[PDB]
Structures are given as structure tokens and as C-alpha cells.
Design a protein around this ligand. Structure first.
Ligand SMILES: CCCCCCCCCCCCCCCCCC(=O)OC[C@H](COP(=O)(O)OCCN)OC(=O)CCCCCCCCCCCCCCCCC
Ligand SMILES: NC(=O)C1=CN([C@@H]2O[C@H](COP(=O)(O)OP(=O)(O)OC[C@H]3O[C@@H](n4cnc5c(N)ncnc54)[C@H](OP(=O)(O)O)[C@@H]3O)[C@@H](O)[C@H]2O)C=CC1
Ligand code: SF4
Lengths: 318, 77, 110, 169, 86, 340, 76, 116, 78
């Protein structure tokens, strides 16, 4: 795929011609990247699974820049159809919990293998696959085990594999980084009640994914999106409780006693706090020595606290 | 009066564009001594009234040219 | 037991029931975007509300046993209502809001 | 783990659904039955909206009983043209509105800018502001037209399939 | 008569140690007048028909006017309805 | 023990199913009164709209950062519990001889109709909005000012009764059809009855978008159906309460049933029928009453708070104190007092 | 091309049922009007509203909006 | 027959008097900055407001004619009028604040080579 | 001295057929100062018919005053 001058234009509907396809994108991260992507005149095929949740991604652009397809990772034909006409494709995918119909396997391994097989069958340039921080092949968080397997499969076939490993993210409606800070009825977990690592702001993640998804000369490199400075622990909860309510109330329960709530979690209508999250609370950022970052793609991601002042401020006392 | 101008020579020192605090004699000018702009003059006046949590009228803002005048109006409460 | 205690005990649990149905299955996802003044007639109405309640509380035992006090409880409560109705004829003279700004004076020239 | 059974499945289209079509259609029928908006009502198209409250093409023969309050509402009929000046107030109304929310663009001006569309002070369609689920064409669309759009929205509601989408069809 | 003395004493030493919120003091002084009636009513029940309960209906009717004068006087703890002051 | 819990379930399902279809009923009768047709589409006939609307508006549930959830998640449940339902503890002529209530009737209904008012006030206390709580204090002030002249008139109509248990009013009133035929201040009771349970021609604190696009708080979700159901249930309770004392239960065809049941049944076949016609009597005296509420919804417009307090503390209350300067007087004059 | 209009100014007012509507048109002498200024009673009565509304209450003001025909599609 | 925050329109003659008048306007427009940050809930700090207000007045330091400076004074005092209360909304209010860089991505480094 | 507060009257539906943004100030729930605030609906017809022809002008022109349509047509035509 060949293009013209650069990414950043100065006006909407001065359209590019880049035809992207973003998997997932109904939820958290995929809001802001297609918000950055349809802002500057690119056609987006965004497939979905729930009709009522796909709506608020339409207003990012005006016409032909948002499209809905009815994918499902079970159906080969749906994903086959989904990227026939595409030019670049990203998949942010993968719940932080198993469903009542999905394993942790085959939501980013064979779910990834199907779509990457469609990529190879369609010769799609610039396949970008997100994957988790701390994506090892070791056991202890089988989430991380499965993301390592997914990166292995995306490197098995398709050398066009720009793998990106963001840190724990930080934005509006943070699924399990600040919703467990903001609502937070009793945030209670972390047997090791400290000793977490790098936060990254979400619009900086989206800017990183935007500045990777258009430039060339970055095929088959893997990125890790480090936190800017602080790599800080659960002491940021204290900065979260710098807001006057201080309702955070960490009660530092025993480990095997904490499992039962997670084993309750499979029975519930809505997802809560499945045990691979509890296992990742014993992990940290096993930071890759050799993976290109924001300084390679020429960005400086924003710091934690002053952005947290904006980001949590409905929730003050007076 | 005593150590009110300590606070004032703390605020004006914390204010930028004055590279020499040794050039800040307390009983001294603003625009002659330090080359403060007439805009920046009332800028640091509003900084002073915001530090002490006090509100000034318009003519009191008109007459301030040196900080001895400022301390003399600070003395009014 | 067994008569209406069941009603005043069943009903709070029914209230918590129809409350606690949709606390779970309604979608929340709360995104974002979710001294004073006065008048005399906003205050004195409720202040003067109270004595005219508890004179009815005064009147309520009398109207319970209107009998066993014949020819005489009538006289006492007529005196009570006279002493109260003169308080009413005090308060009829004053309690109303006043429109502050409406002027009419004739105009003069030199 | 490490292995996968999951085959090539159908589109969201089915008929073998035990009990979930029934329960989902009950909840969907409840949502499809009452269906009240909040008036936003900006111009001439609001005069036709209040003609739907007129006795000829009555709202209340269907259930449309609108409150004047964005929390007690379901769908938000944007009628009339939409100024540049209004649009932040409109999105702020849109956000304080519960999650099963839809938007009807009533009137040509409300979608794709309509008859002005070339003003400095008009918004070129509410697609630049709020996500819309049913459009309604034309300067003032008929009371017929608004009710036809309402029935088409309810026909969309009859395909929401939310409970069996919890089942991941 | 535990039931009335305990609520009376707690209202009383709540009215003592009340270094916050003038109206909590004011309503503790109110609740004294229903801490006393739980004494009075059960003494009347342990005795008889209406001897002390007449004083009970008196103290209820008068406790109303207590709270009425207390509100309508607390309104004038300041200037009246509202003006500039300090 | 089993018979009374199935009794109480029958009575609760009667009142709940009743107040459910009442909103459809009033909307239909407004609609025919507004020369249109009401909910004519819902499902199977068109009798079902509220019964689907309840399931509809459960599943919304917002909260507001301007207010503690702990008060507004309970204060519309407060008036749902106390104002709506346990006013029926008095069993306001549960229309037979029998009730589900022991005794000491009318002032219990007084106490609970009194108890609803700060359920309204603390509801309006919420959100700390300087334009809201003054409207709340307005609503509650007019609410108590017409509570007072419900109170001071149904204590004077029981001066023809003197017995405070619930039934004795009703067995007293069957001789004269005492309720309205001896005194027409029913009508001012009626015009008091629209205010103390505001479903009114007054609509006064329902300045729906005169404030910042919200009237009460807009506590939508389960508190909305709580407030909605409790307002309508307070309406049918106070309407029953009108049909309790100052309108009559026990219609005179049951007094004539001496000339009917003695021509119908032989001797006490399980009391099979008389409670049913007695219920029929009380029901047709109750729904015909609230049909006038649904009139006065759509006949006369809102009523202008300063004039509303004018209408309380200047006109109706001195007429009232005259009227119980004469009803102690006139029975003392003509013959004599009532016993108990 | 529309049509020819002779040049010059005019103003014409009729009583619309909301009040005197005036139309002030400066015609170029060409196909298109060089200036048109409307004049609306709903823009004058709205202007008078502050001088009228003083010394009332808010439910007075709700009625006094509707009396002077304040349909705001005749503002500009 | 009213005001909202005492907007007056009377242009003086002498440039010294207009200088003093714009100076007092600058004081009120600077003093209202924590009231602005309260009122609109911006992300940036009050000194960001102050340096941008100073930037806006340094945009018109070297304007010659007092009979241009009159309507510049009217624009300044009038937008102070529409900022001192809640006429402007925060979406209307951010039109003064090119705050963030990351919206743009990589862009023009003001070289001729990268116009192409 | 007077210490009065203010309200915003109608964002959307206070008076029907009007976007009546009225910034209204009260002392004792008395409208001591009234500041109507209209102009939310400045659709700019007054600009737009400077580039339209006269036959084209009229369906702009009864979009003003949308409850008395052909009377507004008639005043433009006169
Ligand atoms: C004599 C022998 C018998 C002795 C016993 C006597 C018992 C008689 C029965 C009670 C007497 C009825 C008294 C009725 C009181 C009503 C008085 C009243 O409303 O005054 C009007 C007043 C007008 O306001 P204002 O301007 O302040 O007046 C000054 C004008 N210079 O106030 C107002 O603003 C008017 C507001 C009224 C709102 C009413 C709304 C509609 C109500 C109609 C529904 C009732 C119909 C259904 C019931 C009828 C059944 C037949
Ligand atoms: N703690 C964290 O969350 C972190 C996130 N990441 C990575 O970022 C990626 C995106 O994060 P985030 O925006 O929060 O993801 P989302 O919470 O937004 O969910 C991803 C979307 O894809 C859908 N989806 C795709 N495939 C499936 C499938 N087989 N089964 C069920 N749902 C599927 C999901 O549900 P639906 O089908 O209903 O649309 C969802 O809508 C994550 O996948 C994660 O690997 C990395 C660092 C930290
Ligand atoms: S869409 Fe048509 S009817 Fe509606 S405001 Fe625009 S011009 Fe008027």
C-alpha cells in the first residue's frame, strides 16, 4: 500500500483513502483510536457484536468513515467478509475474563489465528495486533500465558506483525484501573497490596497506535508502551484518595480466601473480577529490554497525577 | 507591617521575569527598578491581592508604583 | 399477631423487592455529566402551621367524648374557639406577599 | 486448555432459541410499548410534533407520553433546525439520559443540515453531535411521517435481541 | 423508667457536649421533652387512668409552641431574611 | 395463620393491580375527555399499558453526583411504603362488615397522611441545587397547609360520630346517608383532597422545565415508578377516605336488602353474596369519585402559589372555623349530642 | 435568473397575528436582494419582556411569555 | 433598564484614559481567572489562564489608533461580560485554548520539504 | 443590600415552541431584574437570502414565524 505526504492533515473530510478495520472497538480502547482515525478522513470498517453498543462510534466522522459488520469469531465467513476490502487492520480483542461460552484460549490465540489467516489469505498490509503487558509464556496468569501464545501465533504466520504491548491503561471509564477507584464500593484485593507498575494514559495509547498504523518501516517490530515516568504501585490509590472521599478501603485479604468471589464471578449476569486478574495482582511489568516505545515513534505520554486531576473530577465532595 | 513584605518579596520572587532577587530592594520601584510592564504591574498587583485574600478598589490599584505603597495599603486590614 | 402486623412487615420487604430488582440488570456505566434567598411567606406559613395543628390535637379528645360533657363542654370549647379565632383575626390582617416594584405618582413640570 | 472446539457459527439469526426469544421479546415488548420521549422541539418540526399530540394522529393511542425531563426519557426526538449555539446543550442533554437511549432526527434540517445547511450558525446535521438510529425526512414531515418513523424504530426494537446477545449469538 | 431517663440524660449531655451545629443542640433540647414523657406515661400506666397523662397531653401541646417559638426566634439569630453582612 | 396471609395477599394484589390499571383508566378518560382515544394498542386489547410500562422503566437507574444516593434511593421508597400502602392498614372500609384492621381508625389514616409530607420534603431536599430546594419548600408548605384543612374537617364530621374506631362511622351513617346529605362541605373536602395528595389542577411544584429542565429531581428508574405508584395509590386511598367518611359506604340497597335478601336466600348460606354487593357499592362510590379527579385534571389550570396560600390561610379556614362554630352549636340547639 | 427587480428601498408592514411584521428590502436592481431585514413582533415583544416582567413571580412569568406570542422561530 | 455585570459603552477621547481603562479591564479580567476555572472546570491551571490572557493582550500591544482601540476595548469588556457568568459554556469556552498537541500527530515542522 | 441569585429558565421545553433560554434573577422569588436571552435559534435567514433569488427566497421566509406561514409569505410578497 502506497500513499501521500504524511498523517496529520489540517481539516476533516480531506480524506485519506486508507481503509482500516478495527476489531472490537465497541468498548474501551477502540473508542479513542477510531476517534483519531475517522477524524482525519479514513474509511473504517468496525465490526461489532451488540447492536445497541455500536452506536456511539458513529459520530466520530460523517459519511462512509464508519461502517458496521456483523462479525463473530466463531464464524469464519464473517471475518472473511470483514477484511476483503480493507487496507490496514488492527485487532484490539479479548475480554479480561472468560464468558459462559469462551475459554481464555481462542479469544486471542485461535481467535487471533482465524483473523490472521484471513489477513494472509487477503495479503493485507500492516497487520497490528495488540497484546497485554507482561505477556509471558509462563503460567501464573493464564491471561498472560494466552497473550504470549497469541503473539507466538501472530508471528508463526504473517511476518507483517506489528505487535504492541500497552501497559495498564488510564482514561475515562477505565475498565479495572479507575472504575475500581471511582465507584469502588470496597476495593479489597491485592494480597501483595502494593507492587504494581506502569500506567499509560489512553489517548496516548491511541496516539501511539495512530502513529504506528500509518507509517511504514516498522513492519515486524514489536512495541511496548511504557509508563512515562513513575511505574508506580497501588500507592497511586492514595493519590486517588487525594480526592477528599478516601473511600478506597483496601482490606488486603488472603489469597486462597479471595478465590471464592472470583468463583462466584462466573455465575453472575455481569463480569466482575475473574481470577486471572487476581493472579496478575501478583505480577508486575516484566519490562522488555528491547522493544521500541513512545520515544521511538516520537511521542511523550502524559504523566499520572495532573491528568488524574481532570480524569477523576466528577467525584469530589463539595 | 512586619514580614508582610516578607510575603510580598516571596510572591514577587516566585513571580518570573525578575532574574535577580538581589535587585529586589524591598523599598524600591517596579517598572524603574525591575523593568516591569504596565500590564505586568497590575498583574503582580492582582497576584498580591490574591495572596493576601484581600480585595482592592480601582484607585488603590491606580496609585501602586512601589511596594512601600503596596505595604501601606496592606496595612489597611 | 396475625391481623395487620403482617401488612406493615410485608410491605417494607416488598418495597426493597421492587427496588432491588433493577439495581442489578439496569445498565449503569456512568460516563460523565450526571448562599440563598427568602421570603416571610415562605417561612411564616409553616411556622404558623404548627399551632393550628396542635389546637386540632387539643380539640380531638373533646370531639372524642362530646358526650359525658353536655351543656358545659360546649361552653368551654366555644370559649376555646373564641380565643383561637381572635388569633385568626390577628393574622388575617397581614400575611401576604407584596409586589415590590409598581410605582404610580403624577408627573410635574416647572 | 490450549485447544479449541468453536466452529463456524451462524450470523445473529436463529429460531432454535429456547426461552430467550420469549423472555427477550417480553422485555422488548415492554420497552416497545410505553416508549416516551423528551421534547427537544426547536422549530416548525416541533409544531408537527405537537400535532402528533393532536387528536387526529394521537400519540397516546400508541403510548407516547413525553415528560419534560432528560432522565425520565427513552428516546430524544431532535426536531427543528439545530443551531451552532445549541449543540453543546443538546449533547449535555444527551449524556444525562439513561443507557437504553435512541435518537430520532425529526426533520430535514436535523439530519444533514437541511434547508439552511450553509449558515455560519447552523450545525450540518445532528450526526456531528449525537448518534441517531432513525432519520425522519423533509421539512416539516407529516404527523404521518413521524409516526411512521416511530413504528420503524419500534420495528428496530423488535430486533434488538439483547438477551440472546448475552448468550453470544 | 430506664427508658425515659436514659433518653433524657443522653439528650442532656448531648446538649452539653455540642461543639458543632446549633440545631442539633436545639433538637436535643426538643428530645428532652419526649424523654420526659416516657417517664410520665409509664408512671400513669403503672398507676391509673388520666391523672398524669393530662399533664402529658399538656406538655405535648406546649412542646409544639416550644419548637414554634424556637424556630421563629432562630430565624432572627442574624439579620433578618438576608442582606449584606461581613 | 394461613387464611390471613392469603387474605393479605388477595388484598395487596387487589390494591396493586388496581393502582396499576388506574393510570390506564385515567389516561383513557382524559383522552375521551380530550376528544381522542387513550392507550388502545398495547398487546391483547389495550388494557395493559401500565403493566408493560412498569417492566419498561425498571432498567434505567441513574444516580447524580450532586446527591447522596442513600436518601433518594429510599425516599421514594418511603412514600411507597408508608403513604401508599400502610394507609390501607386501617382497611378504609374494607368494604364488608369486616376489615383486616382491629380498631381506632380515622386518626391512624390521619397520622400516615401526615407522615407522607416529609417524604415529599426530603425528596425535594436532594441535589443541593439552590433553585430546587426552594421549590421543595414551596411544595411542602402548600402540602401541609392543605393537610391542616383535611384534618380540621374530618375531625368535625366525626362530631356526629364521637367513636374513633373505623366501623362506627359507617354503621352510624347508614341511617341518613349521613355523608353528604346532611352537609355538602364534601366539596371543600374534595377541593382539599386534590391538594394534600397533589394529583391536582394545581401542578404546582411540577414546574417541569421552568427550572433547569427538571422538576422534582428527575430520579428516574425504580424511584420513578415508586413515586408514580405512590402518588396514584395515595389518590385512591384518599379517594377511598372520602368515600369512607364524608362520602358514604354501604349503599341503601343493602338497607333495602331486608326486602331483598329475605326474598332471595333462606338462612345464611355461607354469607355468599352480601359482601360482594357491599364491595360493589363501595367500589362504585369510589371510582365515581375519582372520575371527578380525572375531570379536574383537565378542566382548570395551575394555581399560582401565592394565591394558593391565599386560598388556604384566608378563605377556607375561617369558613371552616365558622362551620364548627355551628355543628357543635346546631345539634346542641335542635335536640342533643351523640353518644359513643 | 429569477427576474428583474427595479432598484431602491422599501419597507412594508402588515399585522401578522403576533403583531406588526415589517419587511425591509433594499433591492440592488438585479436578480437577488441586496439586503433583506425582517422585523418581528416576537423580537420586539421579547425585547420588552424585562420591562414588563418586574414585580411578579415565576408562574406569572410563564403566562406572560405566552401572552405576548413568544414563538422563537421569529427571533432573527 | 438593566445590566448584567455593568457593561458600559462610552468611548473616551484621550489615549491615556483609554490606557487606564484597558488596564482596569485587564485587572478584572485577570482577577476572574479562579472564578473561570471554578465555573468551567478546565484541566489546565490558573497560571495557564493568566499567561494566555497576557498573550491575548500582547496580541494588540502595537495597535496605533485609539479609534481602533475603542472597539477592541468593547470586545474585551464584552467578552469579559460573557465570561463572568455562565453565558459561555465550556465547549464554547475552549475556543481560546489550543491546549493539546497529541490531537495532531506528526505534522508540519514549518519546513518547505515537508509541505510535500 | 440586595444579594440576589439567578436561574436559567428553559433549555428545551419550558414554553413549547420556544428555545427560551431566559437568564432570570430573583431576590424573593421576585423578578427584580429580567434579562431575556433569546437567539439560540439564529438560523441566519437574514444572511442566506442575500445569495438566493426572489422565487428562492420565499421558502426561507415562512420558516420564520412557523405558526403563521402564508401570512409571512404574504408580507414578503407585498
Ligand atoms: C347554609 C346551610 C348549610 C350550612 C352548612 C354549610 C356547608 C356548605 C358547604 C361548604 C361551602 C362551600 C364553600 C366553597 C369555598 C370556595 C370559596 C372560593 O373558592 O372562593 C373563591 C376564591 C377566589 O379568589 P380571590 O380572588 O382571592 O377572591 C376575591 C375576589 N374579590 O378562591 C379561588 O381562587 C377559587 C379556587 C377554587 C378552585 C376549585 C377548583 C375546581 C373545583 C371543582 C370540583 C368540585 C366539583 C365536584 C364536587 C361537586 C359535587 C356536587
Ligand atoms: N487490564 C486491561 O484491560 C488492559 C488492556 N490491554 C489489551 O487492550 C485490549 C483492548 O482493551 P479494552 O479496550 O478494554 O477491551 P474491551 O473492554 O473494549 O473489549 C474488547 C471488545 O472486543 C469484543 N470482543 C472481541 N472478541 C470477542 C470475543 N471472542 N468474545 C467476546 N467479546 C469479544 C468485546 O465484546 P463484544 O463482542 O461484546 O463487543 C469488546 O467489546 C485488550 O484486549 C487487552 O489485551 C492491555 C493492557 C491492560
Ligand atoms: S427541517 Fe424543515 S420544518 Fe424543520 S426547522 Fe428545518 S426547515 Fe423547518
Amino acid at each position: 500500500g502506497k500513499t501521500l505526504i504524511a498523517k496529520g492533515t489540517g481539516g476533516r473530510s480531506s480524506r485519506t483513502g486508507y481503509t482500516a478495520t478495527v476489531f472490537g472497538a465497541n468498548g474501551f480502547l477502540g473508542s479513542y483510536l477510531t476517534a483519531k482515525l475517522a477524524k482525519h478522513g479514513t474509511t473504517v470498517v468496525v465490526p461489532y457484536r451488540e447492536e445497541m453498543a455500536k452506536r456511539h462510534l458513529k459520530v466520530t466522522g460523517d459519511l462512509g468513515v464508519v461502517n458496521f459488520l456483523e462479525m463473530d469469531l466463531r464464524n469464519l465467513e464473517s471475518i472473511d467478509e470483514a477484511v476483503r476490502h480493507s487496507d490496514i487492520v488492527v485487532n484490539l480483542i479479548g475480554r479480561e475474563y472468560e464468558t459462559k461460552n469462551f475459554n481464555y484460549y481462542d479469544v486471542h490465540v485461535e481467535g487471533a489465528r482465524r483473523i490472521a489467516e484471513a489477513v494472509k489469505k487477503h495479503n493485507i498490509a500492516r497487520y497490528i495486533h495488540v497484546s497485554a503487558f507482561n505477556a509471558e509464556i509462563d503460567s501464573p496468569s493464564e491471561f498472560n500465558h494466552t497473550k504470549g501464545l497469541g503473539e507466538q501465533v501472530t508471528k508463526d504466520i504473517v511476518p507483517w506483525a506489528t505487535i504492541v504491548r500497552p501497559a495498564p491503561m488510564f482514561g475515562r471509564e477505565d475498565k479495572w484501573f479507575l472504575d475500581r477507584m471511582a465507584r469502588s464500593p470496597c476495593l479489597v484485593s491485592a494480597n501483595k497490596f502494593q507492587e504494581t507498575s506502569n500506567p499509560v494514559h489512553v489517548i496516548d495509547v491511541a496516539a501511539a497506535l495512530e502513529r504506528i498504523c500509518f507509517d511504514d518501516s516498522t513492519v515486524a517490530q514489536t512495541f511496548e508502551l511504557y509508563g512515562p515516568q513513575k511505574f508506580t504501585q497501588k500507592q497511586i490509590i492514595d493519590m486517588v484518595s487525594e480526592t477528599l472521599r478516601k473511600e478506597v478501603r483496601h482490606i488486603e485479604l488472603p489469597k486462597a480466601l479471595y478465590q471464592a468471589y472470583t468463583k462466584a464471578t462466573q455465575a453472575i449476569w455481569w463480569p466482575t473480577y475473574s481470577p486471572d486478574q487476581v493472579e496478575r495482582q501478583f505480577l508486575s511489568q516484566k519490562i522488555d529490554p528491547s522493544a521500541k516505545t513512545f520515544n521511538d515513534l516520537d511521542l511523550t505520554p502524559m504523566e499520572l497525577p495532573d491528568l488524574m486531576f481532570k480524569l477523576i473530577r466528577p467525584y469530589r465532595v463539595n | 507591617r512586619p514580614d508582610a513584605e516578607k510575603r510580598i518579596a516571596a510572591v514577587l520572587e516566585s513571580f518570573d521575569k525578575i532574574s535577580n532577587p538581589a535587585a529586589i530592594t524591598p523599598t524600591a520601584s517596579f517598572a524603574k527598578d525591575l523593568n516591569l510592564d504596565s500590564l505586568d504591574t497590575v498583574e503582580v498587583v492582582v497576584a498580591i491581592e490574591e495572596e493576601f485574600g484581600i480585595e482592592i478598589p480601582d484607585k488603590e490599584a491606580d496609585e501602586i508604583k512601589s511596594v512601600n505603597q503596596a505595604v501601606e495599603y496592606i496595612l489597611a486590614q | 399477631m396475625n391481623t395487620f402486623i403482617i401488612f406493615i412487615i410485608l410491605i417494607p420487604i416488598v418495597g426493597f423487592a421492587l427496588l432491588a430488582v433493577n439495581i442489578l440488570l439496569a445498565v449503569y456505566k456512568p460516563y460523565n455529566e450526571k448562599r440563598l434567598a427568602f421570603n416571610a411567606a415562605f417561612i411564616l406559613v409553616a411556622i404558623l402551621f404548627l399551632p393550628f395543628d396542635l389546637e386540632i390535637s387539643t380539640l380531638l379528645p373533646y370531639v372524642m367524648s362530646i358526650y359525658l360533657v353536655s351543656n358545659y363542654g360546649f361552653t368551654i370549647v366555644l370559649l376555646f374557639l373564641l380565643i383561637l379565632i381572635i388569633g385568626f383575626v390577628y393574622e388575617i390582617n397581614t400575611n401576604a406577599l407584596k409586589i415590590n416594584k409598581h410605582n404610580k405618582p403624577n408627573t410635574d413640570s416647572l | 486448555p490450549t485447544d479449541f472446539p468453536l466452529p463456524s457459527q451462524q450470523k445473529p439469526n436463529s429460531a432454535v432459541d429456547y426461552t430467550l426469544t420469549t423472555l427477550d421479546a417480553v422485555a422488548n415488548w415492554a420497552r416497545q410499548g410505553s416508549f416516551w420521549p423528551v421534547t427537544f422541539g426547536l422549530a416548525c418540526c416541533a409544531v408537527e410534533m405537537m400535532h402528533v399530540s393532536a387528536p387526529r394522529y394521537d400519540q397516546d393511542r400508541l403510548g407516547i407520553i413525553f415528560r419534560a425531563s432528560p432522565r425520565q426519557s427513552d428516546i430524544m426526538i431532535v426536531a427543528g433546525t439545530l443551531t451552532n449555539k445549541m449543540a453543546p446543550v443538546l449533547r449535555q442533554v444527551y449524556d444525562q439520559m439513561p443507557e437504553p437511549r435512541w435518537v430520532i432526527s425529526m426533520g430535514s434540517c436535523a439530519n444533514g443540515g437541511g434547508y439552511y445547511h450553509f449558515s455560519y450558525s447552523v450545525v450540518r446535521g445532528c450526526d456531528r453531535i449525537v448518534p441517531v438510529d432513525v432519520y425522519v425526512p423533509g421539512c416539516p414531515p407529516t404527523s404521518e411521517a413521524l409516526m411512521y418513523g416511530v413504528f420503524q424504530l419500534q420495528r428496530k426494537m423488535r430486533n434488538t435481541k439483547i438477551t440472546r446477545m448475552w448468550y453470544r449469538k | 423508667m430506664f427508658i425515659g431517663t436514659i433518653i433524657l440524660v443522653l439528650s442532656f449531655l448531648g446538649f452539653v457536649f455540642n461543639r458543632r451545629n446549633i440545631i442539633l443542640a436545639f433538637i436535643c433540647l426538643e428530645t428532652m421533652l419526649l424523654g420526659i414523657n416516657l417517664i410520665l406515661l409509664r408512671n400513669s400506666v403503672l398507676f391509673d387512668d388520666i391523672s398524669g397523662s393530662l399533664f402529658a397531653i399538656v406538655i405535648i401541646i406546649l412542646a409544639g409552641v416550644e419548637s414554634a417559638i424556637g424556630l421563629s426566634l432562630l430565624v432572627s439569630y442574624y439579620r433578618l431574611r438576608g442582606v449584606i453582612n461581613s | 395463620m394461613i387464611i390471613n396471609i392469603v387474605e393479605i395477599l388477595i388484598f395487596l394484589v387487589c390494591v396493586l393491580f388496581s393502582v396499576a390499571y388506574l393510570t390506564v383508566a385515567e389516561r383513557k378518560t382524559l383522552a375521551y375527555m380530550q376528544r381522542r382515544l387513550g392507550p388502545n394498542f398495547v398487546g391483547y386489547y389495550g388494557l395493559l399499558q401500565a403493566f408493560a410500562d412498569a417492566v419498561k422503566l425498571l432498567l434505567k437507574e441513574i444516580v447524580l453526583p450532586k446527591e447522596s444516593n442513600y436518601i433518594i434511593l429510599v425516599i421514594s421508597p418511603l412514600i411507597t411504603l408508608i403513604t401508599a400502602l400502610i394507609g390501607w392498614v386501617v382497611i378504609p372500609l374494607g368494604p364488608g362488615i369486616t376489615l383486616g384492621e382491629l380498631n381506632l381508625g380515622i386518626l391512624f389514616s390521619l397520622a400516615i397522611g401526615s407522615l407522607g409530607v416529609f417524604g415529599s420534603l426530603l425528596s425535594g431536599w436532594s441535589s443541593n441545587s439552590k433553585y430546587s430546594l426552594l421549590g421543595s419548600i414551596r411544595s411542602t408548605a402548600q402540602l401541609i397547609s392543605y393537610e391542616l384543612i383535611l384534618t380540621s374537617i374530618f375531625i368535625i364530621i366525626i362530631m356526629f360520630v364521637s367513636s374513633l374506631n373505623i366501623t362506627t362511622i359507617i354503621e352510624t351513617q347508614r341511617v341518613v346517608w349521613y355523608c353528604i346529605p346532611l352537609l355538602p362541605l364534601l366539596l371543600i373536602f374534595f377541593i382539599a383532597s386534590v391538594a394534600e395528595t397533589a394529583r391536582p389542577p394545581f401542578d404546582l411544584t411540577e414546574s417541569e422545565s421552568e427550572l433547569v429542565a427538571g422538576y422534582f429531581t428527575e430520579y428516574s428508574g425504580s424511584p420513578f415508578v415508586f413515586f408514580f405508584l405512590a402518588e396514584y395509590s395515595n389518590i385512591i386511598l384518599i379517594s377511598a377516605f372520602n368515600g369512607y367518611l364524608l362520602l358514604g359506604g354501604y349503599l341503601s340497597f343493602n338497607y333495602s336488602y331486608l326486602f331483598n335478601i329475605l326474598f332471595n336466600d333462606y338462612s345464611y348460606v355461607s354469607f355468599l353474596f352480601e359482601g360482594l354487593i357491599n364491595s360493589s357499592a363501595y367500589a362504585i362510590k369510589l371510582v365515581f369519585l375519582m372520575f371527578s379527579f380525572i375531570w379536574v385534571r383537565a378542566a382548570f389550570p395551575r394555581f399560582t402559589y401565592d394565591n394558593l396560600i391565599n386560598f388556604c390561610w384566608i378563605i377556607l379556614l375561617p369558613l371552616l372555623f365558622g362551620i364548627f362554630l355551628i355543628i357543635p352549636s346546631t345539634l346542641y340547639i335542635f335536640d342533643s349530642f351523640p353518644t359513643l | 435568473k429569477g427576474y428583474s427587480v427595479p432598484p431602491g428601498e422599501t419597507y412594508t408592514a402588515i399585522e401578522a397575528p403576533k403583531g406588526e411584521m415589517g419587511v425591509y428590502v433594499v433591492s440592488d436592481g438585479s436578480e437577488r436582494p441586496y439586503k433583506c431585514k425582517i422585523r418581528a413582533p416576537g423580537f420586539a415583544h421579547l425585547g420588552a419582556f424585562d420591562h414588563i416582567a418586574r414585580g411578579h413571580f415565576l408562574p406569572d412569568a410563564v403566562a406572560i411569555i405566552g401572552t405576548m406570542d413568544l414563538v422563537f422561530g421569529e427571533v432573527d | 433598564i438593566a445590566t448584567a455585570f455593568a457593561e458600559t459603552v462610552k468611548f473616551s477621547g484621550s489615549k491615556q484614559e483609554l490606557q487606564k481603562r484597558t488596564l482596569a479591564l485587564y485587572r478584572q479580567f485577570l482577577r476572574g481567572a479562579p472564578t473561570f476555572a471554578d465555573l468551567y472546570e478546565v484541566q489546565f491551571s490558573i497560571p495557564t489562564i493568566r499567561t494566555k490572557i497576557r498573550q491575548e493582550f500582547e496580541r494588540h500591544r502595537f495597535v496605533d489608533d485609539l479609534s481602533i482601540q475603542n472597539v477592541l476595548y468593547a470586545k474585551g469588556h464584552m467578552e469579559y461580560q460573557e465570561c463572568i457568568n455562565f453565558w459561555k459554556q465550556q465547549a464554547q469556552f475552549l475556543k481560546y485554548f489550543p491546549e493539546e498537541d497529541d490531537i495532531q500527530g506528526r505534522h508540519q515542522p514549518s519546513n518547505f520539504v515537508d509541505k510535500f | 443590600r440586595i444579594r440576589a441569585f439567578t436561574i436559567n429558565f428553559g433549555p428545551q421545553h419550558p414554553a413549547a415552541h420556544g428555545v427560551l433560554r431566559l437568564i432570570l434573577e430573583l431576590s424573593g422569588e421576585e423578578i427584580i431584574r429580567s434579562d431575556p436571552h433569546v437567539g439560540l435559534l439564529h438560523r441566519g435567514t437574514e444572511k442566506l437570502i442575500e445569495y438566493k433569488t426572489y422565487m428562492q427566497a420565499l421558502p426561507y421566509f415562512d420558516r420564520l414565524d412557523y405558526v403563521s406561514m402564508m401570512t409571512n409569505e404574504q408580507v414578503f410578497s407585498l
